[PDB]
Amino acid sequence: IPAFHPGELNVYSAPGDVADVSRALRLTGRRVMLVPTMGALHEGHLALVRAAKRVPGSVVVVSIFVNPMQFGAGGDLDAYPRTPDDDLAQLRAEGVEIAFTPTTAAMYPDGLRTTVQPGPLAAELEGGPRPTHFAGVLTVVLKLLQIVRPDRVFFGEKDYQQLVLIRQLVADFNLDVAVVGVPTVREADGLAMSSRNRYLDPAQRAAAVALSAALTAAAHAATAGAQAALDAARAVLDAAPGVAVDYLELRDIGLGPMPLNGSGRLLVAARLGTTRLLDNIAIEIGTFA
Amino acid sequence: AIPAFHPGELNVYSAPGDVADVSRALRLTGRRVMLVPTMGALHEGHLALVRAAKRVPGSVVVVSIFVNPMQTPDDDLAQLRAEGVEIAFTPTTAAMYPDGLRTTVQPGPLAAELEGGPRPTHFAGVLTVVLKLLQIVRPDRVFFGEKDYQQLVLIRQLVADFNLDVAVVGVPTVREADGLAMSSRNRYLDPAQRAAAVALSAALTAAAHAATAGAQAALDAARAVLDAAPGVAVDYLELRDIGLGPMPLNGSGRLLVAARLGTTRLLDNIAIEIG
Numbered sequence: 001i002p003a004f005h006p007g008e009l010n011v012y013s014a015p016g017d018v019a020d021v022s023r024a025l026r027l028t029g030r031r032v033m034l035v036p037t038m039g040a041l042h043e044g045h046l047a048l049v050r051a052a053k054r055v056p057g058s059v060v061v062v063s064i065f066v067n068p069m070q071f072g073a074g075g076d077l078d079a080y081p082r083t084p085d086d087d088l089a090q091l092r093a094e095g096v097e098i099a100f101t102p103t104t105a106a107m108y109p110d111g112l113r114t115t116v117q118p119g120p121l122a123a124e125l126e127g128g129p130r131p132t133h134f135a136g137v138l139t140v141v142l143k144l145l146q147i148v149r150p151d152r153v154f155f156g157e158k159d160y161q162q163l164v165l166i167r168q169l170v171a172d173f174n175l176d177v178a179v180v181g182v183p184t185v186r187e188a189d190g191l192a193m194s195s196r197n198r199y200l201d202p203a204q205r206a207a208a209v210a211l212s213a214a215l216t217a218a219a220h221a222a223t224a225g226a227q228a229a230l231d232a233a234r235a236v237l238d239a240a241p242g243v244a245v246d247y248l249e250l251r252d253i254g255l256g257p258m259p260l261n262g263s264g265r266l267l268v269a270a271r272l273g274t275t276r277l278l279d280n281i282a283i284e285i286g287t288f289a
Numbered sequence: 290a291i292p293a294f295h296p297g298e299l300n301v302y303s304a305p306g307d308v309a310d311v312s313r314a315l316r317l318t319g320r321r322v323m324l325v326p327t328m329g330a331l332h333e334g335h336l337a338l339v340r341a342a343k344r345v346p347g348s349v350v351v352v353s354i355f356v357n358p359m360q361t362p363d364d365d366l367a368q369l370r371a372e373g374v375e376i377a378f379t380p381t382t383a384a385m386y387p388d389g390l391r392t393t394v395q396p397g398p399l400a401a402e403l404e405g406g407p408r409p410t411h412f413a414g415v416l417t418v419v420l421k422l423l424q425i426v427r428p429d430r431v432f433f434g435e436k437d438y439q440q441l442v443l444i445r446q447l448v449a450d451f452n453l454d455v456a457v458v459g460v461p462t463v464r465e466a467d468g469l470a471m472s473s474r475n476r477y478l479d480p481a482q483r484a485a486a487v488a489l490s491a492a493l494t495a496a497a498h499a500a501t502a503g504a505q506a507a508l509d510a511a512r513a514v515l516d517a518a519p520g521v522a523v524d525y526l527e528l529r530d531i532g533l534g535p536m537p538l539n540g541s542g543r544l545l546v547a548a549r550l551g552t553t554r555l556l557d558n559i560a561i562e563i564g
């Protein structure tokens with residue numbers, strides 16, 4: 001065990017260090033909560049930390065790691081926002097006791113060798129033109145769960161397809177961890193919080209409200225059935241200046257090889273300039289809404 | 290409430306949640322959980338894995354028996370009983386794959402080589418079920434035979450690459466009196482094939498002793514012995530480093546062979562020390 005100073009923020013970069021501290025904590029009965037992040041932390045992340053914190057006897061581990069394997073070549077990786085000074089200040093403000101900030105060399109000492117192969121859901125939606133993306137995400141989340149061995153792991157619903165694939169990973173590999181999905185945190189106008197919102201100029205920021213407006217409109221229209229819901233969202237997106245829709249799809253909650261029944265998820269992805277935004281919402285169809 | 294566990298008797302569990310609960314409860318009581326994965330049809334080679342697991346102080350031995358569709362019950366169970374194994378884990382296919390084949394493990398490029406030649410997806414299946422069994426049973430140590438050497442290397446890659454907290458223990462191949470590596474396939478060999486099959490081990494041990502004269506003398510001694518046998522179709526005979534990369538100029542390596550006798554595919558491998 002490296003030093004662990006309770007009541008303050010302990011930062012570990014070595015996987016063996018956080019693994020040893022985590023195990024020692026669990027053996028003294030603390031329940032270890034993991035919040036995996038890519039840093040550039042905002043209130044949507046602090047909502048995950050806060051949910052983890054309110055679990056009785058919890059110690060919270062927040063990982064910060066910009067995982068190269070979920071990024072495609074073509075500039076995305078070098079462009080991802082890195083603000084580590086701010087990130088650690090926020091965690092200290094929140095009373096988090098452990099930040100895990102591994103190096104690429106420590107995570108990938110053998111490059112890409114054994115990896116996770118997701119099911120067919122990973123080839124759709126965000127995965128369509130980024131066919132290796134979710135293999136990257138599931139591989140890193142598997143390693144983070146094995147290093148930290150948390151009791152529960154916390155993800156935002158904003159990246160809903162990712163949350164679903166993570167539940168698949170946990171079920172399919174019999175992982176002994178509870179996956180907690182936490183509702184999206186939104187700006188006062190409805191804009192889903194995201195580290196990539198910083199890339200919208202004032203006009204794009206004004207226009208971006210159309211995603212959440214479209215989704216909320218669709219959720220209320222849905223008393224009138226699926227067609228109405230989808231046509232309401234499309235009309236709102238169509239009225240928004242310079243919002244370029246990539247997909248808008250209504251699916252079952254598990255996103256899967258089941259037809260939509262009464263409860264669904266409506267998902268949108270759109271480009272504003274170069275910035276791609278995602279959002280989604282729970283939908284109840286007809287009698288159900 | 291934890292399922293029933295009776296110390297000193299064979300406790301059989303078919304439900305993954307049950308063996309998980311019992312393994313967790315036992316480890317908290319000061320036992321060290323040892324896992325021996327098998328596909329049943331047990332022979333002396335499997336009992337040597339059991340015996341290695343049993344000698345760890347505080348051990349409780351978990352033997353899984355599961356025919357992995359992706360890669361006699363009573364008799365197997367009696368053998369485990371006679372060895373004093375306290376837990377057998379006998380899941381159905383449905384209990385292991387309740388959502389079918391969905392998230393799986395993709396091995397590194399080693400899985401494309403050697404055995405991965407005729408069976409390109411074989412090792413994805415083995416690594417997937419191995420990862421699952423490790424997560425269900427969460428053993429301190431997991432035991433595999435050296436006879437499936439490439440499999441063992443790939444397991445060790447799985448464990449390192451996914452940061453798994455288990456010790457992988459490789460146990461030397463158990464052999465018949467004439468050196469033939471034990472395998473349930475040996476029983477299909479007719480008398481002429483069984484007599485010729487001894488060339489695999491004879492070639493390898495000849496090479497291991499010829500290796501004081503260097504790598505080419507070792508390979509040439511092994512080929513000469515295989516060349517002296519009738520009806521032995523050699524699929525490969527390769528000298529690699531101990532992690533199955535390229536053999537270095539000297540130092541430790543491993544020599545692997547595979548051959549077909551009739552319809553039966555046999556494999557064998559041995560440590561080699563170059564010069």
Ligand SMILES: O=C(O)c1ccc2nsnc2c1
Nearest residue numbers: 036037038039137140141159
């Ligand atoms: O930073 C996040 O929003 C985030 C969201 C999902 C993640 N999966 S692994 N690391 C992740 C980080």
Ligand SMILES: O=C(O)c1ccc2nsnc2c1
Nearest residue numbers: 326327328329415418419437
């Ligand atoms: O029965 C065996 O010889 C055997 C050998 C290796 C295995 N990896 S998973 N299940 C396995 C079973």
